[PDB]
Amino acid sequence: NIKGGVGSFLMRRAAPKSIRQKYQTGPQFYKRKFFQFQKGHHRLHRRISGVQTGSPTHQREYERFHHLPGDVRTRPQFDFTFGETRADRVMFAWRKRGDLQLYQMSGRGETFVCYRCGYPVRSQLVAVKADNWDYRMCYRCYTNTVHRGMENDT
């Protein structure tokens, strides 16, 4: 009958459907409406990167992220570089901090979605929750989770 016109950009304010999504009171389990990326980036994902300065003989692979705080400044407990190469190219694995364990991948950074921040992250550092590789965390959220003490909760 009677037709009117209202743009969808006026309703985008009501996009979040819960307290967790509107006020960010917890981890965004792949349910995030508003994203904040650096002004100028076209490929919309966050990047936790490392600096390579030498050969694997002098500079180890985990020493690339030494400029970051946390467990990347310690040597890992497990090392898979020697022997049969991992199918997913996991080079190192740090000690389990509660339900989270930090891994380092080989090759170009794989773009995954951290369930705590909700952002697509491209990095070689992946924190797996309870050995379940469906729930991964970027290294930044991993360091923040350990700092607050929420390692066994999130």
Next chain:
Amino acid sequence: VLYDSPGLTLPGCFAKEAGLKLAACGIIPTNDITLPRSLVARYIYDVLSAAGVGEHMAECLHLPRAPISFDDCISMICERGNLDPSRAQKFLIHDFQLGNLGRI
């Protein structure tokens, strides 16, 4: 005015005898894997030869004699030649469907 009930009356997963009757009356297709022309023509021959209707079946199918067995009837339908027993079974099924065998 008329209201139609789409999925109220339907054969669905039928029994052996019900499927034989439906295929003999032409309600369901004859499947070359599950419901064979051979089985449905065997059913037709059995229900016809239950009573003394062998000579009448031969008269309807233009057979030189009253058939003793279903295989003999199929072979005589082939003779009435280049056609195969499959074609003979098809002819018998279609004759029963059109009513060339009688009212039943």
Next chain:
Amino acid sequence: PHIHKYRELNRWQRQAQGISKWDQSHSHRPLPYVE
């Protein structure tokens, strides 16, 4: 102001639909009336 109908459609929408420019409304050609 304007009185035409296609004024809500921009030049891109007009050329995508296939409409002639309504601003150049030429009237020297009569309409195909049933004579």
Next chain:
Amino acid sequence: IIVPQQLKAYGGTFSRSVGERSNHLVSDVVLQSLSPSSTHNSPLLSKNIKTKTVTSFEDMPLYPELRSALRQLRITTPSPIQQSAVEVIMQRKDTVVAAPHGEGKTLAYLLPLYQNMIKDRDVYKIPLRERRPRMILLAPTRELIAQLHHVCSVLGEATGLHAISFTSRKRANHRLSRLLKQQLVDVMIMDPKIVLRLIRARRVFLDDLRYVAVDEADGMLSSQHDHDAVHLLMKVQKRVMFKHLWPVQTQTVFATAFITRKLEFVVGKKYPDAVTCIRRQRMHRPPGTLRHRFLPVEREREKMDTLQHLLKKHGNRPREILTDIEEEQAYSKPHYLSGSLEELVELRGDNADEMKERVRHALEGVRPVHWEHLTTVAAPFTCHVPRTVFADGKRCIIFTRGIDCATAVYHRLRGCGYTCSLLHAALPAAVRRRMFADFASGRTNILCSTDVAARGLDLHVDFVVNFDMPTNALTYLSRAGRTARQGRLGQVYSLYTKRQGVIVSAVRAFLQKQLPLEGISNWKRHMMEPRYAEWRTHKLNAIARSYVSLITQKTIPAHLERTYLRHNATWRPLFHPQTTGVHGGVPPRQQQRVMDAITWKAVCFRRGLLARR
């Protein structure tokens, strides 16, 4: 052969509003945004904003006379606006009292301004002279002036201060001058146009003027009231600059239900240090207990038949007209209702006061207002005409457009057998007072009025009927802000046609998502076209959501990885979004290269098809 331009990036058009949404409109029509991303550049709302509250009235300093005035008004717990604004005004600062309709905005600035006058009268002992008042109140309409005079008289009875009001009457220059000659006043509740006339006629002086309160300041400071308040405030401001009289710091208070561009700039540029008390999470929204209902009428003629249905639905039953004498008496004799509290409570179904308040809550539909850790009941209406007739039916105001429609609907309902009263400005002074007194006292439960009764009227209106759909949200909120007052149950019926279908779809959508009615108009192109940077924001968020859905559920081969991220995960800017409606958001040099390839392949395919035909 004809082939259109195939490659496009955006086919629509972007609005030219570079400042904010609805930049082309006037402030009198559109409401301003209250988001911090928008108020960051505003001259008023980027400055200091008061948000802290005070729980009880005992925690704030009040004189015993003001304590008794609150008990007389039956008010115990302060509303969120009073919890924040009373303290700032008592600190003698220019304050912008911003609150929705029916939250105690009137008493929010009357209590502190009265206490400051008591302190100047008792502590500082500033003498009151003949033609030099202490406070000046500014109100738009005549009924609001009479209503503000009623509240100031309740406060002035206990505090000892004398408030005076004046509307236009016969021989007004004579009657107004006698008041200034016979009695001494310190509160002048008048119109800014008339008080400017007395100042220029040298009947009232700006000496020892310490307080200027502007109710409904969003409109008073706009051109809809001829900038009379703005001209007066500039005279008050130059009085403060005068250094040969005693030092008076005249503080100015602005009570508003809306915030517009006029209000922000006229206060932010003229009052640099002005504290704003506002909760942006409730400001531009209807009350929670208000029920909205949009009834579409297919034909404009059938609008009267729909209105008559709503009246019969809510108890208002018309008297039967079956004879010629009754048909003549329907228009001649003004019929009035009759009843009392005793018979009405018998019909519906110490201890004396508790029962009077129990019936008062059941009739007005008063629900306990729910604030955080604070709950109260709504005080009785502060109207200068107390209700004395209680008949069987729901009370209503029928807002129409223009004066002629209000007059016509008034006579149509009378001919049908309805007891209604007409209220607009064209009525004479005697009839206008009588017509409002009939509805406010209870002799009439149906008020056919124009937009004059939309701002500042605390009446027992059970439901409101918009006979003509308002053209903007500012008028929509003010009209509907009459039936739900302090947690009372209210209902609104808006009759609209196709010509207002755009704003109805906008308002109906904003209400369902519980959003502020900011930037709402009736122009369809304005409500559908976004800004480029706003479209860019929602586009970037949509791209990131598609990236999440692509990563977490899809496995992509290596040869498809490049194209998947190009179409689902890459922010691709547009080319000159100002002229997007011409080149489609794609550089025409790229379009020329694309069109060259397609045209060549189209010509080759056409030459073959023509040769085959």
Next chain:
Amino acid sequence: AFRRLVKRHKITNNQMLLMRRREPYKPTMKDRQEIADRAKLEEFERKNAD
């Protein structure tokens, strides 16, 4: 709507290569707008004192 073609200045000290703003002791745009508003308001009040 500012100058996209940056103004060039003769570099006499090597720290001019590092400094981005021409006059660092000068208040920012909005700050000096507020300063000008305040100064003009004070001058207007002085003019209206009598």
Next chain:
Amino acid sequence: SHARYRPLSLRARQTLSEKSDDLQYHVVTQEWFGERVDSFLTCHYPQWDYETIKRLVQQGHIYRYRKNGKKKFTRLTDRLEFDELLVVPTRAFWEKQLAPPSGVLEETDGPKFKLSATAREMAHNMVLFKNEHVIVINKPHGLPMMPTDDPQEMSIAAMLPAWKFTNVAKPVVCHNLDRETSGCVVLARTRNAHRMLGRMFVKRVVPNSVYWSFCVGKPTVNYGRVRMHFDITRGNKGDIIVARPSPTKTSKVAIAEFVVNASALEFGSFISFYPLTTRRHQERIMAAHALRCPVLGDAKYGGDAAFPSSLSLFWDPENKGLPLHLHHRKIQLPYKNTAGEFICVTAPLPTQMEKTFKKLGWPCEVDDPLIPG
């Protein structure tokens, strides 16, 4: 009994939170000024679990008021401010039409089922893969996954207390199968493991499981996709399933990619299904009607056609009680092994399927490469 709870949108939930007065306001005094929200709540509610407190705070049922006129939703790691209020719902707050999270109310176990020695032995025998978080069992044919309408029948839900080897609580089944379907069934050992694995059994885009079936007749195509739309209606003593090619509002889609691995000429076929949805009797319906090849022994869909006389040398088509030739073969898990590949659990073929494969000359135990590891 939770029978008084109603579906509520965010608006209605906020309105009920505003209206309901069943709230407690803890005043943050000097002694608790500066503490964390989770610490404060754990010290003030010893009867609540940390999971319950976390759910309440993160969903917004517990909030705080800083005397600003609005409610403030916070994280468990936020510090408390001086002279503010902490609003926590009481017991009576959840007695209205608003359901609380799982940890708020207290459930009662009540009865405890008893499992015999033979039952526990067969439950231990059915185990295929065990982990710190998951247990994959081999459910056989004819065993119900859940208690049926007849309470006297055994079920995996009743045998569940037999797979708590060292844990305190019994595992929880992550996905259910039909009574006739036999194959790998996943049981989460931890509550968090179940909450994380539930994501794996909802509709997806990439398949992570295989169904090996023996269908009567060979379809016209070797591989392809099947998409139907099922509408379930309540009948007299059953459910009427209406399959449509076009979607309806009351329908739900069923999608699966099928590949015919090997087959007889035109009388029988071996087909691998890779589903993307979870619909009742999905594989059986898509085989009987979409592929037009009823599964061997599927008497519910194509009864007389599910017992072909072509296999009369192997299976007698007169008993009509042979097990369904549909087996949940292989399933991938989110957990990785030492080599770096996702752990894929495979179940051996049942007796009837192995017999059919051996009679037709096909290898029974073959790895299906279409589901990687």
Next chain:
Amino acid sequence: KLPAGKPANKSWFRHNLIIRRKASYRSRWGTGAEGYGTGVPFSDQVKLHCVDNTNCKHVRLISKATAERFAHCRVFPAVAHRVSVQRFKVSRHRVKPGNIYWVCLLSRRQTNTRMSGLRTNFDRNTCILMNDQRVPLGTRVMYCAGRHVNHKYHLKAVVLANFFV
């Protein structure tokens, strides 16, 4: 296209059933007369005669590979394509079309070179019906059995056959 990341061949199970040979210059099937191991095995959908006194006349092979070299270590299932009609009427007569039995291969029309160098071209393709226990349904064989039949895998077949080559 499964898997989605690295799509693979959907004939993985067919590869376990077929006996293929890349048609390079070093690997070739050729005709059976080239020597031992040069005959192409019978593919599926191949018609064979049924020479035992059963109701069946022709069978169709289900196996993807069928030859004499591995007639002792592989099972050959087949379907009764054509059945003799008895106009005037046991287990051997109860053979109905569509049924699936195993078949013992007796001879082929293709050239077969033994290891001794003796090539042979029989008149027609030949086989006999057997059950899952490798017991022939017929009581007599109306054709010649090949030398490959002389194996313990075909004990009852050798007993029922009366002539070998």
Next chain:
RNA sequence: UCGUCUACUUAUUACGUUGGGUUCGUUGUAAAGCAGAUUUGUUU
């Protein structure tokens, strides 16, 4: 989250016949849940 459910009952007798009436439940969740799609090889 791919559960299960063409038989009970009021009577009648005999070693099946004849008249009436007609679902249960495991687990998770209070959103981190609910329709449909989830495709891309200038191999032109």
Next chain:
RNA sequence: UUGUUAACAACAAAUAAAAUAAAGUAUGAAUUAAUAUCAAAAUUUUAAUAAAAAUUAAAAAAUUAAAAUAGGGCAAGUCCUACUCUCCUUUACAAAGAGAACAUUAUGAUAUGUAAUUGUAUGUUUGAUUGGGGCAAUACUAUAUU
């Protein structure tokens, strides 16, 4: 392997033998062309393939053939929602090229009108501030009344 017929069709495996289509002597275009006597490979990273950077590493010359990469145009495909265009309908809005009726001379013809309230195709048909308030002769000094 499937049909016709009393040799014909394609096919899958030995797709194998065997037939025709060379450099080189001559003549000699066209698409293309930012470019260092171009840069094998691996790794790390940077604003969308990055050949852009950095770190490891160590990559010959000439002729032939290959589509693995670069190069050769691509905001695309499916679903849902909303708006519009298009297209139909007439009873109202503006124009309508068709006809009428009327005035004037004649009861015979050509025209002019100030007379046209008829019709069929064509245009349009959702920005209402073109509103609502306020102002209301009898100044000034006084008097009485409700």
Next chain:
RNA sequence: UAUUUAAAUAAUAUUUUAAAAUUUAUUGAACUGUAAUUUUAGUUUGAUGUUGAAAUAUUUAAUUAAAGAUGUUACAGUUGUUCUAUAUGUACCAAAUAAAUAUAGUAAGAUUAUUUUAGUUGAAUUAAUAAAUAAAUAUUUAUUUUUCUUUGUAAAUAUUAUGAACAAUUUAAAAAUUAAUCUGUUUAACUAAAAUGUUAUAUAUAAUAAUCU
């Protein structure tokens, strides 16, 4: 009404190519279309050639119809093929030829001349009765007033559309890192001088070991 003080009277100009339907006047039926007269082929689609001996040849399959050829007449775009539609009216059907700076709220692209000689780098934003004042950028131009030092203040002119949605805090500071608070980036006479930072520590609520209840 006319109480207030100057002056160098000179006008003609104002990038460029394009961004589209068209206006006025003609032409075209040797191509193609219809009527009158003197195994072929069409349609669909795949398969070879891909500037091909062809600016349209050959082939596969299905389907629909089958008196064969040439020329000449009449019909011309406002439309013609005597209803409409498709198709077509001479090698891109808004047909072709001749004139047009006719004009596109105007999409975009180019716009000829080193060694230079001075102010701001994210502000401003009030439709509409007596309210001191928009701001940035650029060109000309004007104010030597105090002081311990420092201090780009103002007119007359030209232009201005480079475009953000939520949340938190705030009459004081996001300090909630799942938060950014945003205009980048280029900028260098020569020779010298010159102060700057990435190393790892693998065991102390730890590690290595025995007795016994």
